[PDB]
């Protein structure tokens, strides 16, 4: 068809593959969820996706992994969390200029880290995002004259937690909110639409995302996290990603692998508090760092169990296809 | 014999191999030293050892390096320094629950890091410990409602050092205290029993440990460290480990290698102050990080000298056996 | 000739190869520029160069890459920035003792990091320097009794920038100052003499250095950097190094590679602000860290463009010779 229609198929496929899902329709649903959260954040993220995909075209990289949207998904998040962490409010059009420049570095980091991780056959998860956003937010900070960021400071007092003033239904609502906060959205409807976007692609990814969000939610009640942060889903968006990555995407899904995914989600949830407290000294927020660290430290695990199998990256599409391919290869 | 007696032989061998020594009797002496320091810390560390060893059994890892106690030694330290850095006092039984969960990640990190370090034939020293304890302490911190940790803040004033109020004998007593503080104990008798535990295994390791402790002690007098921290052996427990690792364990011991071990101990002692000051901003203590960094940066050194030999990890037992094997191989 | 004359040829060649240039005359000019900035800093850096080169002799390393001055250039900078960041003023001869000891670790780190980077054919740029100086400054800090360092604290207020009180000519003078601040000098004459030292070696390196300094200077006006820091060339010395490294040294110089060098200089300039703000919490200054990170992340980039060529490290001398060798190899 027309080249502009291919480019947008690419940006659509690159929009949804933050969830490790590759469908234009899922990307459409995710963008629609972005516009119901905040129209400014949605356009900021779409512009980041466009620039990140176009930079890969400029750098003359492989055509195959631009159609999947691999270079796309690291720009939508950059735009989204540059719009989230600004103090100039909505529709501050001067924020688009740093998005233009700083999203062009996502393909560069994706190509640099893929040369290091090629000797262990590990996927590059979001490290271009984490590096890029940490760089931008530390370079500008809260006291910048042009692009100030929200004030984020460490804790210096004992939280006052009341266990007789916790409400179960809102706590259960953190499961949709926790999955919708991977992109930065805290509206339960956005999380729900994200759930349908996952389900139409592959139900098993949706199940693993939901259980990861729950596991992250209950892993913050064990260390007395303030309720107003669990209700906003800030304690369970790394766990969702970790569970999705470990469950059936990069490991052939079995009940042992399911338990391993639960363990990885718990480990990512506990690492999230540590990376939120340590990076709070710099004034920086934890941004998908715990997911990357936990996923890479669980994908590097070795085991003599014949039923915990690490799939080669050249043949990873989605968990049901992974099962079909594995069973075909065994026979 | 009975399987329960094998398991405990393993936990015994995994208790003492923090010192790179593999003997049930040395582990018995070390545990006895733990009980004379603090009975609560001793049981906390023994429980961590048991859980860390059992997790390796669950993860179906190699039998050979569970008998040596490789997966054991990263749990005793986790338990010990979780009990050391708590504000709830002795016999706070609710602290055992985080020890159960967080010690189960030591085998995972040991297997993940061994896949990265297998391409350079480098041992995994304590990085599972360092990562795990840093994670836990940063996740909970001093202001947690459930497991608060001791307050550790950086310096903001000039120490008042009086050189006419320094006592030589207590300064010399920092050599046993400095070696006993590798596990966390500050009782000179614990350090002494640790010395006998080393000596009965191999005298050369004991000699290198003692000289490393001395080198770390005198490397803090060169940068005007407060006396009350040298007297507690906090400035010479990384140096002890570095000297033990470099002297005759992973390098065939010669006088050139002995000097290299002295240099590594000095470098680790100076890195200890840096990692204590930088990690003090987070509220975290330096925990064997300087040892890991110095040992890995000295084991990666290359040299045309034919008498500085790096032993393969598959044939590293203890320095005298290393000499015997090297001389046999040359002939 | 006489051995002492070879040693000094080596220290001369190791003095100038911070700029990736290998000439005794360029080293002479650089040392002369050091003595016009500050005679104390110059002798401090020369002593560091001598000790770093001599340590490589002690460690019995390869003769070929000691003649080039590879082990030399990491000591001059250590001495220079140990003299820059002291509070005891000029001619504090007790500062030479830490320079003696701490410069002996540059060969060790250079040999350790070259074993890690040998599997990706990446040069070790200044990481021994960065690690060593960060170690020393964090170990001593501002409140040390023996070697206190200058007070460096993060920002907590909105800078008051007046755009009607900016002067163009002094802003243009930041190009020589910005290149002279790679070594630590802020005198425009030192930067000029550095420019002639580059030009006599290879004009293209001088051109890339100048354009990198300009790019770093104008990359700080985009995020509202205070004028008194751009005027001192603190915002463009990482960019100069990054541009020199990427332009024609490690990549065969073409217009596409020239644009890539501009992009790398811009990325290093923006990373400089981030590493200055984050490392300011520790009380540490950014010291060539942004250059190392940007150069390594741009040298690990892969591309299907046939005219962006990464040269093997065994055949990298200087850009014009690189062009000649590449054209000869193609024919």
UniProtKB/Swiss-Prot annotation, chains A, B, C:
Keyword Phosphoprotein in annotation: yes
Record-level Gene Ontology MF annotations: cell adhesion molecule binding; urea transmembrane transporter activity
Any single Gene Ontology cellular-component annotation: membrane
Transmembrane residue ranges: 27-47, 65-85, 93-113, 122-142, 191-211, 230-250, 259-279, 281-301
Glycosylation sites: 160
Gene Ontology BP term (one): urea transmembrane transport
Key words, A-Z: Cell membrane, Glycoprotein, Membrane, Phosphoprotein, Transmembrane, Transmembrane helix, Transport
UniProt similarity note: Belongs to the urea transporter family.
Name of the protein described by the UniProt record: Urea transporter 2
Organism, as annotated: Homo sapiens
Organism placement in taxonomy: Eukaryota, Metazoa, Chordata, Craniata, Vertebrata
Designated gene of the protein: SLC14A2
